[PDB]
């Protein structure tokens, strides 16, 4: 639902939202699902995976 | 704890994993929490946000 910030972020890509502490923000559902930073134990790689890509082994 | 890729994923930003189907993938834990795609009611404006950042309203 509603959430409000609690710290100021600053974008790091183009993807993520910039916003100030106070601000009301309002979850938006997506077909990926929420992120994780996550590390391939195959690959050796690490960053962030859509969550609904992936179930537990 | 470990997962398992359940579809091919392609990065799409400098900071997103690629991966193929059949991938093992572990959680890694960072301060900034899972990420969630957030509308912002005081800006307008719409990307992915750090969820330790926000509480509910």
């Known amino acids: 639902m509603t959430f409000v910030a609690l710290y100021d972020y600053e ?6 939202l ?3 502490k106070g ?3 309002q979850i938006v559902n997506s077909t990926e699902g929420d992120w ?3 590390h391939s134990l195959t690959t050796g790689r ?3 995976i859509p969550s ?3 179930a537990p082994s």
Chains 1, 2 share one sequence.
Not at 11 to 16: C, L, P, V
């Open 52 to 54: 609904n890509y992936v």
């Open 46 to 48: 690490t960053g962030y």
């Open 36 to 38: 994780w930073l996550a």
């Open 23 to 25: 601000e009301r923000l």
């Open 18 to 20: 910039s916003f100030k």
């Open 11 to 16: 974008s790091r890509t183009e993807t993520d």
